[PDB]
């Protein structure tokens, strides 16, 4: 049977344009769609339907077989609510998390025949030589927020057995994914997962405890030049927005006179206590920062260069919930966009793992550069939100400072 | 007409059918329409109705050597975008034969969702508004009604599925009232198949056209003439005159701007100059000598035949890009040397501050984006930049940037880095401590410096802004300093520079500083908080 889904009051269906796709990509999608059509999952549609959601194809880390991925971000945002499961604050504590793709379990359930129109999507033709192939869903779509919802009971229903077989293991569900964490060592872990699948199948490596949100560390030297100090002052001065106890008075005094940027200045004991006092303030995360569930989660990223990137997740400015550094993966050496999207997938998963919802990203890339090639390296079932920005020269100089082993 | 499953049409949200009054006409326009409608009435297109229809659309009567649905439409629901992007020659494949069937009034061949038919009611007037008028309605898609192009295509698409299944090696393009049909068969088997399709159509009521109306190669598509083996650019013709109005000069620059794509060398600097301070579209501006000339220098180029070749999937796709000048780029996409599919250029995108490599990055992406639409593939690039300059730049820039598989080609002018701020304070170099200040209200400012070598200066500025003084200070620094300089400033903008090192700006001043930076052997920019 089907349940009556609807749109948030006074909202209309998505009418988002299908961006152009590669041939390789189109061939697969056509291939993939004739099948689901056959299997009755989707049905071609008419011109009297004007809604549309973008689609594309991806190789979910392990393929040759392409996976169909839809961007229901608009639909999701326009779809009524159902007021998922409350976040197991304990998941982020597990020694190791493993993710499972279970969108496959949705086609089973039929979609309200009155909400289907809104799930319309289009397969483009190269050189517009053919009118796009217009389809729509007859079953539950993967990537839509209504799916994991409607399929909740059925889902919860099948996991109890496993849940009751291991209770030292947490099962978290987000969209199409399933986040499974436990403390069993590796072998006893992945054997407990394949074991989990088997069960999961007769129907249809993360380590959170290492995520040491690290500190800021100021440079230490034998002798400091006028320039050395100026740079430090700048950084500290900025950092004073976070730790008001930080002071550069005594240092900004050593900076009296028009001396050579390269000349060396001796640190007064005062400027020394002062510095030493700042080193202390930066020693621990600022007090009072608490996550608000009725507020959006933000993820701002910076390109430090040389394969390096840093990020901060907050809700209120300078009140970071977590900080990190991302280093490119073997292979992405000459691809800024690949490095970036891999970065974003990681952060969004960490975010999900800790707060169970995606953050809205602030990206150091031009909309054009991003939109053109992101899908090329995306591997997640979900798609977070983003906006493109210009990195303030200081924010980068400051975070480039964070500590390393 | 048709045994074709109708499409369910509805009115926009809660609105209701048109009720506009029937425009009054002569005894001559009425008897004309009285003629044509009794015709349609019989063909099975329209249907005489009566007092059971509040709706009404204004029928007019023009003689070609007509019904105004404006309102009915503005009340009709929204359909899916009737194909809005069309093929481009550069992406077409060569065919042996290509026939174009003219499914003209195939509109009046498709049934209109019965229920909706009412809304399309109209009335024939009486001789000077006498007794009741003649009332009718549409049983088929109405020429001019919003939902007809989409509903027609949908239909044509459904109808062709069988044939298309029946012969894959036969490409059929749906467009407007034309079915451009091509193949790689022998002219005989082709001719035979056209008649087969033609008859399939006939099996659904679409009376496809005669020999008289018949269309054949070459075909005019966008700005090209299409031949099945290759295409040619429809020669463009610049008019000659003894009197040029404004419109005259614009419509021209337009045409010329279009040519710039294909044709290389086209210029309109002196031609554009004639629009300066223009009072009215009809004004007559005598062409300067310079304008008379360049106009003459173009006429020539345009008199050059530019033919082209079609897309060959079995061959590679290449793109070469040339920086025609600062901020302008030329590109040509070919598979086999000198046999281009497409070419084109990008107007001097005048940003606020960027550099050549970044600008190259955008041309590259605008292209890639173009390519992916035309070919579902992305070209190999031949770029006038050393792979070192690339690595050197991109690897450090503050923003995610990238360039698909590419290869250098030493086709000057090559794009390079005009300068590079030192990574570390220069030992030895003089150190200018700069400062600019101004009263933002009185716009009166001062800018100057003092160095560790005891050199100082201050200039009083007027009609300036603070950013300008801050920057001027730096300009003076570069002016009064040697080949290697250190510069410390508390300027927020100077901070944007150390991070982006732009080599072109919207600000002439910034430009001057850039010209200075490009001149030094070493420059170190240091920013510091103020006060
Ligand atoms: C779009 C268009 C103008 C089609 C008819 O003109 C030609 C099209 C092709 N090549 C192709 S792939 C083709 C054949 C039928 O429809 C298409 C899109 C080649 C020569 C000409 Cl003259």
């Amino acid at each position: 049977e089907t349940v009556p889904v609807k749109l948030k009051p006074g909202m209309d269906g998505p009418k988002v344009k299908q961006w152009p796709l590669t041939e390789e990509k189109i061939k697969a999608l056509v291939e993939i769609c004739t099948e689901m059509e056959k299997e009755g999952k989707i049905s071609k549609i008419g011109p009297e339907n004007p809604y549309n959601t973008p689609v594309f194809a991806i190789k979910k880390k392990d393929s040759t077989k392409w996976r169909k991925l839809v961007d229901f971000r608009e639909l999701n945002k326009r779809t009524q609510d159902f007021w998922g499961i409350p976040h197991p604050a304990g998941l982020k504590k597990k020694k190791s998390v493993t993710v499972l793709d279970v969108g496959d379990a949705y086609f089973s359930v039929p979609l309200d025949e009155d909400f289907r129109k809104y799930t319309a999507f289009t397969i483009p033709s190269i050189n517009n030589e053919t009118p796009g192939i217009r389809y729509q869903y007859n079953v539950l779509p993967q990537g839509w927020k209504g799916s994991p919802a409607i399929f909740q009971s059925s889902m919860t229903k099948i996991l109890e057995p496993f849940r009751k077989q291991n209770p030292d293991i947490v099962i978290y569900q987000y969209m199409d994914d399933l986040c499974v964490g436990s403390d069993l060592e590796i072998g006893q872990h992945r054997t407990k997962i394949e074991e989990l699948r088997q069960h999961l199948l007769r129907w249809g490596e993360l380590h959170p405890d290492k995520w040491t949100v690290q500190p800021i560390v100021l440079p230490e030297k034998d002798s400091w030049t006028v320039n050395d100090i100026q740079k430090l002052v700048g950084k500290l001065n900025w950092a004073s927005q976070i730790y008001p106890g930080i002071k550069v008075r005594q240092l900004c005094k050593l900076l009296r006179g028009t001396k050579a940027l390269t000349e060396v200045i001796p640190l007064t004991e005062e400027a020394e206590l002062e510095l030493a006092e700042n080193r202390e303030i930066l020693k621990e995360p600022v007090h009072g920062v608490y996550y608000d569930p009725s507020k959006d989660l933000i993820a701002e990223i910076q390109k430090q260069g040389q394969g390096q990137w840093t990020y901060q997740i907050y809700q209120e400015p300078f009140k970071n919930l977590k900080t990190g550094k991302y280093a490119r993966m073997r292979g992405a050496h000459t691809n800024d966009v690949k490095q970036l999207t891999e970065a974003v997938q990681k952060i969004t998963t960490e975010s999900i793992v800790i707060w169970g919802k995606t953050p809205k990203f602030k990206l150091p890339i031009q909309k054009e550069t991003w939109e053109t090639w992101w899908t090329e390296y995306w591997q997640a079932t979900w798609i977070p939100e983003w906006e493109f920005v210009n990195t303030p020269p200081l924010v980068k100089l400051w975070y480039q400072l964070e500590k390393e082993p | 007409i048709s045994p074709i499953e109708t499409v369910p049409v509805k009115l926009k949200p809660g609105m209701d059918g048109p009720k506009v009054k029937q425009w009054p006409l002569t005894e001559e326009k009425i008897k004309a329409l009285v003629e044509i409608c009794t015709e349609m009435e019989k063909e099975g297109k329209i249907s005489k109705i009566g007092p059971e229809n509040p709706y009404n659309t204004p029928v007019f009567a023009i003689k070609k050597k007509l019904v105004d649905f404006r309102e009915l439409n503005k009340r009709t629901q929204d359909f899916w975008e009737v194909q809005l992007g069309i093929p481009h020659p550069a992406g077409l494949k060569k065919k042996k034969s290509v026939t174009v069937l003219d499914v003209g009034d195939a509109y009046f061949s498709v049934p209109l969702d019965e229920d909706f038919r009412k809304y399309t009611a109209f009335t024939i007037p009486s001789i000077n508004n006498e007794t009741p008028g003649i009332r009718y309605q549409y049983n088929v898609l109405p020429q001019g009604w919003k939902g007809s192009p989409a509903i027609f295509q949908s239909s044509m698409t459904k109808i062709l599925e069988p044939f298309r299944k029946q012969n894959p090696d036969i490409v059929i393009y749906q467009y407007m009232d034309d079915l451009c049909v091509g193949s790689d068969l022998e002219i005989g088997q082709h001719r035979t198949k056209i008649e087969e399709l033609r008859q399939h159509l006939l099996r659904w009521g679409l009376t496809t056209p005669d020999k008289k109306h018949q269309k054949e190669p070459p075909f005019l598509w966008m700005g090209y003439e299409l031949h099945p083996d290759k295409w040619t650019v429809q020669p463009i013709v610049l008019p000659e005159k003894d009197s040029w109005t404004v419109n005259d000069i614009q419509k021209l620059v337009g045409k010329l701007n279009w040519a710039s794509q294909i044709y290389p060398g086209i210029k309109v600097r002196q031609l554009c100059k004639l629009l300066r301070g223009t009072k009215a579209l009809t004004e007559v501006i005598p062409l300067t000598e310079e304008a008379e000339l360049e106009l003459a220098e173009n006429r020539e180029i345009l008199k050059e035949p530019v033919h082209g070749v079609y897309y060959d999937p079995s061959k590679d796709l290449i793109a070469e890009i040339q920086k025609q000048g600062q901020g302008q780029w030329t590109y040509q996409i070919y598979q086999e040397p000198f046999k281009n599919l497409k070419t084109g250029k990008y107007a001097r995108m005048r940003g606020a501050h960027t550099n050549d490599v970044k600008q190259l990055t955008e041309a590259v992406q605008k292209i890639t984006t173009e390519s992916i639409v035309i070919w579902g593939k992305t070209p190999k690039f031949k770029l006038p930049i050393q792979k070192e300059t690339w690595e050197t730049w991109w690897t450090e820039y503050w923003q995610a940037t990238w360039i698909p598989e590419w290869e250098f080609v030493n086709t000057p002018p090559l794009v390079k880095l005009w300068y590079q701020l030192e990574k570390e304070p220069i030992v030895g170099a003089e150190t200018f401590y700069v400062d600019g200040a101004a009263n933002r209200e009185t716009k009166l400012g001062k800018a100057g410096y003092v160095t560790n070598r005891g050199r100082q200066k201050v200039v009083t500025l007027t009609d300036t802004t603070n950013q300008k003084t801050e920057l001027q200070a730096i300009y003076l620094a570069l002016q009064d300093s040697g080949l290697e300089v250190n510069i410390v400033t508390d300027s927020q903008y100077a901070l944007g520079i150390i991070q982006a090192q732009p080599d072109q700006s919207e600000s002439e001043l910034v430009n001057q500083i850039i010209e200075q930076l490009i001149k030094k052997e070493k420059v170190y920019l240091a920013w510091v908080p103020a006060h």
Side-chain angles (χ1 to χ4, degrees):
Chain A
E1 268 175 56
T2 61
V3 45
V5 181
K6 283 214 301 179
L7 292 181
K8 291 174 178 175
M11 297 294 239
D12 193 23
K15 304 192 175 191
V16 202
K17 73 159 57 286
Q18 167 55 43
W19 51 76
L21 303 170
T22 304
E23 207 181 18
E24 67 190 331
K25 274 176 161 44
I26 299 186
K27 279 181 157 65
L29 283 178
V30 170
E31 219 197 60
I32 285 177
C33 286
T34 61
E35 234 292 275
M36 301 172 43
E37 182 188 9
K38 283 284 202 175
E39 308 174 305
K41 308 184 184 181
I42 59 186
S43 284
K44 288 174 174 185
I45 65 182
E48 77 270 36
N49 179 304
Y51 317 110
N52 182 273
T53 293
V55 300
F56 55 108
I58 63 179
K59 301 272 199 178
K60 229 181 193 308
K61 36 188 176 178
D62 166 22
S63 299
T64 37
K65 299 280 188 174
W66 295 80
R67 180 185 195 284
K68 196 266 260 58
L69 176 46
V70 183
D71 178 12
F72 290 115
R73 279 187 288 175
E74 286 304 335
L75 190 56
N76 294 2
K77 292 190 291 199
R78 309 177 182 211
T79 297
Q80 74 176 64
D81 293 82
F82 312 120
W83 291 28
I85 63 180
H87 193 77
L91 177 60
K92 42 176 177 290
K93 259 160 286 188
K94 292 297 169 303
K95 288 198 181 74
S96 283
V97 181
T98 304
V99 196
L100 288 194
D101 183 355
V102 296
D104 287 76
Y106 297 117
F107 73 122
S108 317
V109 187
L111 180 66
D112 182 40
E113 73 187 12
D114 302 274
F115 189 69
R116 295 173 169 159
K117 63 197 293 194
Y118 304 123
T119 84
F121 62 87
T122 303
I123 309 179
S125 76
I126 299 184
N127 199 41
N128 295 302
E129 278 180 26
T130 302
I133 310 160
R134 303 267 289 154
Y135 290 113
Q136 78 172 26
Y137 278 80
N138 284 131
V139 314
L140 294 183
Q142 310 183 63
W144 176 51
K145 78 163 186 173
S147 296
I150 302 178
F151 182 89
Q152 196 51 198
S153 57
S154 324
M155 182 58 154
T156 171
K157 199 141 94 82
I158 91 169
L159 289 172
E160 288 177 339
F162 192 73
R163 278 176 168 161
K164 287 61 180 182
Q165 284 187 60
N166 301 65
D168 241 51
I169 287 172
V170 184
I171 286 186
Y172 187 40
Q173 193 199 322
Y174 189 95
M175 288 309 97
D176 294 4
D177 299 328
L178 220 64
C179 302
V180 163
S182 81
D183 305 74
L184 315 183
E185 71 110 6
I186 188 59
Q188 304 179 181
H189 173 77
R190 285 188 278 192
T191 56
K192 196 62 52 55
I193 279 293
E194 216 306 313
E195 172 186 308
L196 177 287
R197 294 198 336 161
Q198 276 178 38
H199 175 177
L200 214 53
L201 185 55
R202 59 166 297 185
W203 306 66
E205 243 63 10
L206 289 68
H207 323 84
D209 82 335
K210 66 129 284 288
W211 299 354
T212 63
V213 177
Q214 282 230 59
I216 289 298
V217 294
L218 299 174
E220 262 160 295
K221 310 172 181 309
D222 282 346
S223 284
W224 306 66
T225 58
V226 180
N227 184 243
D228 277 355
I229 298 171
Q230 296 180 338
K231 302 215 297 188
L232 171 71
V233 155
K235 290 153 188 183
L236 293 164
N237 170 60
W238 183 79
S240 66
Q241 287 172 291
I242 298 171
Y243 302 97
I246 291 192
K247 291 166 179 166
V248 311
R249 256 204 53 182
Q250 303 311 134
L251 297 183
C252 276
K253 293 187 181 300
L254 291 150
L255 262 10
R256 167 171 156 292
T258 61
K259 36 226 305 180
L261 227 55
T262 43
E263 187 184 299
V264 181
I265 322 298
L267 296 177
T268 68
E269 287 280 335
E270 298 83 90
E272 257 168 352
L273 167 63
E274 174 180 288
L275 210 180
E277 269 195 43
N278 294 312
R279 295 184 181 289
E280 278 298 271
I281 308 181
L282 312 172
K283 244 175 175 289
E284 295 177 5
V286 61
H287 304 164
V289 179
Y290 303 131
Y291 167 106
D292 192 312
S294 70
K295 194 167 281 56
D296 287 295
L297 220 44
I298 302 175
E300 188 176 320
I301 303 177
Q302 297 88 43
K303 173 188 189 173
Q304 295 292 173
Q306 280 321 304
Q308 264 53 52
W309 308 75
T310 52
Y311 65 96
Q312 311 85 56
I313 299 180
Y314 58 86
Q315 289 174 302
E316 297 288 343
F318 314 107
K319 276 166 282 175
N320 295 330
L321 292 164
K322 178 186 170 58
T323 50
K325 185 172 309 185
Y326 169 79
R328 91 173 180 72
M329 288 200 329
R330 186 178 175 179
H333 175 177
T334 56
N335 204 330
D336 250 7
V337 188
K338 187 173 178 190
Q339 288 173 40
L340 212 203
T341 85
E342 298 184 314
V344 166
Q345 288 186 65
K346 197 170 187 303
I347 300 172
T348 317
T349 57
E350 295 202 339
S351 160
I352 289 174
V353 158
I354 308 168
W355 302 288
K357 55 184 289 186
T358 72
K360 197 290 182 56
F361 288 64
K362 275 178 177 270
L363 306 171
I365 195 182
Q366 182 182 155
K367 172 190 175 78
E368 280 63 52
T369 310
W370 180 259
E371 295 173 357
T372 296
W373 301 288
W374 74 273
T375 63
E376 297 311 305
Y377 329 90
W378 194 253
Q379 300 160 286
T381 75
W382 35 252
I383 306 165
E385 296 300 19
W386 57 70
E387 65 175 66
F388 319 91
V389 303
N390 324 302
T391 307
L394 268 178
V395 192
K396 181 279 198 188
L397 276 11
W398 170 258
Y399 285 108
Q400 168 183 182
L401 267 50
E402 200 161 292
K403 185 177 183 180
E404 291 195 314
Chain B
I1 302 183
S2 274
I4 317 182
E5 178 60 354
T6 55
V7 163
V9 183
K10 304 185 65 57
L11 290 168
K12 267 169 184 167
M15 290 188 85
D16 203 65
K19 289 179 170 55
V20 45
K21 162 180 175 297
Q22 185 51 55
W23 200 292
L25 299 179
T26 57
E27 61 181 302
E28 184 174 1
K29 296 174 183 172
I30 299 171
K31 244 43 59 185
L33 290 167
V34 168
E35 187 81 301
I36 309 168
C37 299
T38 314
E39 174 75 70
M40 306 181 128
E41 171 186 54
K42 209 177 181 184
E43 284 180 293
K45 300 152 69 298
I46 89 177
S47 290
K48 195 161 54 180
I49 57 175
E52 186 58 3
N53 194 304
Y55 316 120
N56 186 285
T57 309
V59 57
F60 300 122
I62 70 85
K63 86 303 298 179
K64 182 176 184 176
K65 304 170 183 177
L66 182 63
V67 185
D68 199 348
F69 284 102
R70 277 183 301 182
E71 292 287 321
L72 164 51
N73 295 332
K74 70 163 271 189
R75 295 189 176 69
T76 294
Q77 71 163 95
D78 281 75
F79 301 84
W80 185 228
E81 69 120 302
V82 314
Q83 201 60 66
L84 226 183
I86 72 298
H88 182 116
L92 289 187
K93 308 189 173 181
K94 79 180 303 178
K95 299 270 138 292
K96 249 66 166 59
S97 298
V98 187
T99 311
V100 56
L101 279 44
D102 193 284
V103 289
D105 50 32
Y107 267 32
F108 300 99
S109 299
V110 183
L112 205 194
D113 177 50
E114 38 292 347
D115 299 32
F116 200 85
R117 286 185 193 133
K118 41 169 163 293
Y119 299 112
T120 62
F122 64 73
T123 296
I124 292 184
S126 34
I127 285 65
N128 215 179
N129 190 62
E130 292 173 351
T131 45
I134 320 305
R135 238 187 181 299
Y136 289 124
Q137 64 160 57
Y138 268 102
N139 314 300
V140 304
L141 259 37
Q143 264 275 298
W145 170 63
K146 182 184 177 181
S148 301
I151 287 177
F152 175 44
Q153 204 223 224
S154 151
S155 300
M156 192 48 77
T157 286
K158 288 193 287 184
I159 300 188
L160 303 188
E161 197 164 13
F163 187 94
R164 299 204 211 197
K165 289 288 186 171
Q166 295 189 181
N167 27 222
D169 54 8
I170 285 185
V171 178
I172 302 167
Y173 180 42
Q174 222 167 309
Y175 175 83
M176 231 78 264
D177 281 345
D178 283 348
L179 267 189
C180 308
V181 181
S183 76
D184 279 308
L185 318 172
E186 301 286 291
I187 80 183
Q189 295 95 59
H190 183 91
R191 171 248 298 167
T192 298
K193 285 301 191 187
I194 244 72
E195 176 65 24
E196 183 170 22
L197 199 192
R198 182 156 190 296
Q199 274 185 296
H200 180 192
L201 290 186
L202 263 272
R203 210 208 85 184
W204 300 76
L206 302 170
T207 50
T208 167
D210 175 57
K211 294 174 183 173
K212 298 189 66 183
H213 298 288
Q214 252 307 300
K215 283 190 183 180
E216 311 201 12
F219 297 123
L220 290 183
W221 200 239
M222 285 163 37
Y224 311 63
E225 276 182 54
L226 282 39
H227 310 299
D229 44 314
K230 90 289 194 299
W231 48 270
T232 37
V233 171
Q234 196 182 320
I236 173 177
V237 300
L238 304 169
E240 313 209 64
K241 302 168 63 182
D242 300 325
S243 177
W244 300 89
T245 65
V246 173
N247 281 152
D248 292 339
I249 307 175
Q250 290 177 313
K251 306 297 181 66
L252 172 58
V253 181
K255 301 182 182 178
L256 280 149
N257 188 281
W258 195 98
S260 306
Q261 289 315 312
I262 301 176
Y263 287 104
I266 299 293
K267 283 163 164 35
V268 302
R269 184 163 174 281
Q270 303 300 155
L271 269 173
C272 235
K273 223 165 173 179
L274 282 49
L275 299 164
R276 301 183 173 195
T278 49
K279 56 185 171 191
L281 304 301
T282 54
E283 192 177 4
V284 175
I285 294 62
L287 321 179
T288 80
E289 204 183 46
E290 283 86 353
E292 206 66 63
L293 166 56
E294 89 169 356
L295 176 57
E297 236 164 306
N298 292 340
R299 287 181 186 295
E300 301 240 354
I301 307 179
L302 298 179
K303 182 184 294 183
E304 214 53 297
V306 275
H307 46 287
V309 71
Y310 287 128
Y311 188 44
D312 172 11
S314 74
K315 284 193 171 182
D316 248 315
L317 243 192
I318 306 168
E320 190 167 324
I321 310 182
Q322 301 80 46
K323 196 201 172 197
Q324 202 176 184
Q326 187 200 52
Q328 23 180 32
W329 314 85
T330 47
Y331 72 80
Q332 46 277 170
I333 303 183
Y334 63 88
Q335 286 179 296
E336 60 189 308
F338 318 163
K339 291 188 171 296
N340 308 330
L341 298 166
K342 191 178 169 60
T343 67
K345 82 164 195 176
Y346 297 121
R348 298 187 177 189
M349 48 250 247
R350 57 285 152 287
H353 53 152
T354 177
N355 65 69
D356 284 346
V357 190
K358 173 59 186 172
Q359 281 198 304
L360 196 195
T361 282
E362 282 157 305
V364 167
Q365 93 77 41
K366 300 185 212 163
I367 296 188
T368 297
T369 291
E370 284 191 40
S371 298
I372 306 311
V373 188
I374 320 296
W375 303 291
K377 288 177 62 187
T378 146
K380 296 188 297 180
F381 290 83
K382 275 184 65 182
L383 311 174
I385 180 182
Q386 268 196 159
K387 280 260 188 170
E388 268 54 66
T389 323
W390 176 233
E391 203 78 13
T392 288
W393 184 76
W394 138 58
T395 202
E396 238 48 62
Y397 201 58
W398 70 269
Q399 177 187 55
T401 183
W402 181 66
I403 302 184
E405 182 190 300
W406 70 281
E407 183 204 18
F408 166 45
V409 57
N410 213 303
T411 295
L414 294 185
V415 310
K416 59 145 196 167
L417 297 169
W418 303 84
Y419 69 80
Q420 273 183 57
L421 296 172
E422 293 305 291
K423 224 82 288 180
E424 289 296 332
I426 305 164
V427 173
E430 189 170 10
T431 297
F432 289 60
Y433 282 81
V434 304
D435 219 340
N439 190 301
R440 291 188 185 69
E441 276 174 36
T442 71
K443 305 196 82 60
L444 233 308
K446 283 190 182 74
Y449 65 79
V450 192
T451 90
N452 59 316
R453 307 183 179 183
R455 185 205 313 246
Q456 46 191 54
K457 160 174 285 182
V458 172
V459 174
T460 292
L461 312 175
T462 66
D463 191 13
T464 171
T465 72
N466 210 74
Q467 69 144 185
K468 283 181 194 160
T469 63
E470 304 199 80
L471 291 173
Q472 177 65 352
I474 306 183
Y475 178 56
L476 299 186
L478 301 149
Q479 290 203 305
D480 305 343
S481 59
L483 276 47
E484 284 177 22
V485 204
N486 287 295
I487 300 166
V488 27
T489 187
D490 66 50
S491 185
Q492 265 286 139
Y493 195 133
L495 188 53
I497 297 167
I498 306 134
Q499 182 181 57
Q501 300 184 62
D503 55 43
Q504 62 196 91
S505 206
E506 68 169 310
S507 176
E508 184 78 74
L509 194 190
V510 177
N511 306 337
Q512 321 182 303
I513 297 185
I514 289 178
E515 291 313 313
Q516 280 309 313
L517 287 178
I518 291 179
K519 290 177 183 166
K520 304 287 183 180
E521 260 176 2
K522 293 183 188 175
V523 179
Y524 183 65
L525 240 61
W527 172 88
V528 277
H531 320 308

